[PDB]
C-alpha cells in the first residue's frame, strides 16, 4: 500500500535507489523514425524521442513525423499525448496533431524561457487580436480568453481548419511555477491545478487524448500524468490499496521514455496521489482546502 511504502522509503532514506530501479527496469523500444536525418530538425533534444509503436502519425502529407507519444491506459480507461514544447518549426505540426486526435485541452508544465534558455516556442497568441496562422497545415488560432492566476493561466483558444472552416475550442492550462527538474510548490498547488484540468471536461472520454508537455515531454509531463492515472485507477475502484504506483509509472514508460526524471518527482507523484485519494474517497472538503493553500489569488 502506497502510503506504508512511502513512509518506510522515506524512514530508510531510500528514493535514489527505487528511481534507478525503475530506470533499470524501463522499456526500450526502437525509434528509428525519430533517428532518420530529415527528422533531426524536428527534435528538441537529441536523446528524447518518442518509440516508433506509440508515436502520433501526422496525416498531412509527405511527412508524417512529430515528436510526440500516445499513452494508452488501458486499465484505466485513460489517454494522454505526451509531446516536447514543439519548436520554430514544428508549432504547425503541434497544432496539425491537435487537431486531428481530437484534443479537447493541452496541459503545458514549463515556460517558454527557463535557465536563460528557450525552452519551447511561443505557440499560442498572446493577444486577442493578434491571431497565428500556420500556413505549413492550413490552421488558424486565435486567443479568445485567459484566467491569469497566481502560479497558472488558463486560456480559452479557437483553433480553425481553414481547409473546411470547421473550428473547436482548446483549453490551454499553463502550470507557469514548476521548475525544470524541480517539483511543484506543494501537493495542494499541483492538485488544484490538476482539478481544474479535470473539472474542464478536458479528459473526458468523449474527446481526444488531452496534450501535456514540459520541455522534453517526460519529466514534468510524466510526474502530472502518473499522479492523474493513479487518482483514476483509485477512482474507478474506489479502492486506494488497489493501486500500485511503481506499476503505473512503469506501464506509461512502455509508451514514452524517461518519464519523470528525478527521484524527488516520483517522491512528490507519491505525495500528490496519498493527498489526493481523500478526495477520491469522499472528503470532498479537502478540494477547498487545497485552492487556500495554493494561493491562486
Ligand atoms: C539532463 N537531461 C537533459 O538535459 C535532456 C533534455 C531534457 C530537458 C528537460 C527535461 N525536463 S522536462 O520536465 O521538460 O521533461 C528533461 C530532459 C531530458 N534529457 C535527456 O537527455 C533525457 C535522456 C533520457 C531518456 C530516457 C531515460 C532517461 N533516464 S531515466 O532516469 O528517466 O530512465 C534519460
Ligand atoms: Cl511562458
Ligand atoms: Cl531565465
Ligand atoms: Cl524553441
Ligand atoms: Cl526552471
Ligand atoms: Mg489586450
Same mark, same amino acid.
Given at each position: 500500500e502506497m502510503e506504508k511504502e512511502f513512509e518506510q522509503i522515506d524512514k530508510?532514506?531510500? $528514493? @535514489? @535507489?527505487?528511481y534507478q530501479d525503475i530506470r533499470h527496469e524501463a522499456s526500450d523500444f526502437p525509434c528509428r523514425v525519430a533517428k532518420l536525418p530529415k527528422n533531426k530538425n524536428r527534435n528538441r533534444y537529441r536523446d528524447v524521442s518518442p518509440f516508433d509503436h506509440s508515436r502520433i502519425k501526422l496525416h498531412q502529407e509527405d511527412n508524417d513525423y512529430?515528436? @510526440?507519444?500516445?499513452?494508452?491506459?488501458e486499465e484505466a480507461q485513460r489517454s494522454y499525448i505526451l509531446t516536447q514544447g514543439p519548436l520554430?518549426?514544428?508549432?504547425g505540426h =503541434? $497544432?496539425?496533431?491537435?487537431?486531428?486526435?481530437?484534443?479537447?485541452?493541452?496541459?503545458? !508544465?514549463?515556460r517558454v524561457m527557463e535557465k536563460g534558455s528557450l525552452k519551447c516556442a511561443q505557440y499560442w497568441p498572446q493577444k486577442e487580436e493578434?491571431?497565428?496562422?500556420f500556413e505549413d497545415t492550413n490552421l488558424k488560432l486565435t486567443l479568445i480568453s485567459e484566467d491569469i492566476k497566481s502560479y497558472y493561466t488558463v486560456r480559452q483558444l479557437e !483553433?480553425?481548419?481553414l481547409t473546411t472552416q470547421e473550428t473547436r475550442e482548446i483549453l490551454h492550462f499553463h502550470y507557469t511555477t514548476w521548475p525544470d527538474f524541480g517539483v511543484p510548490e506543494s501537493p495542494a498547488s499541483f492538485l488544484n491545478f490538476l482539478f481544474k484540468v479535470r473539472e474542464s471536461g478536458s479528459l473526458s472520454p468523449e474527446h481526444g487524448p488531452v496534450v501535456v508537455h514540459c520541455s522534453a515531454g517526460i519529466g514534468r509531463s510524466g510526474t502530472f500524468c502518473l499522479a492523474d492515472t493513479c487518482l483514476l485507477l483509485m477512482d474507478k475502484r474506489k479502492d486506494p490499496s488497489s493501486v500500485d504506483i511503481k506499476?503505473?509509472?512503469?506501464?506509461?514508460?512502455? =509508451?514514452?521514455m524517461g518519464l519523470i526524471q528525478t527521484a524527488?518527482?516520483?517522491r512528490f507523484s507519491y505525495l500528490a496521489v496519498i493527498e489526493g485519494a481523500k478526495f477520491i474517497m469522499g472528503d470532498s472538503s479537502v478540494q477547498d482546502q487545497w485552492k487556500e493553500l495554493s494561493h491562486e489569488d
Open positions: 530508510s532514506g531510500s $528514493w @535514489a @535507489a527505487i512529430i515528436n @510526440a507519444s500516445l499513452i494508452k491506459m520554430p518549426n514544428t508549432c =503541434f $497544432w496539425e496533431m491537435v487537431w486531428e486526435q481530437k484534443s479537447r485541452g493541452v496541459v503545458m !508544465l514549463n493578434k491571431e497565428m496562422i !483553433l480553425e481548419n506499476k503505473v509509472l512503469l506501464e506509461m514508460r512502455k =509508451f514514452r524527488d518527482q516520483l
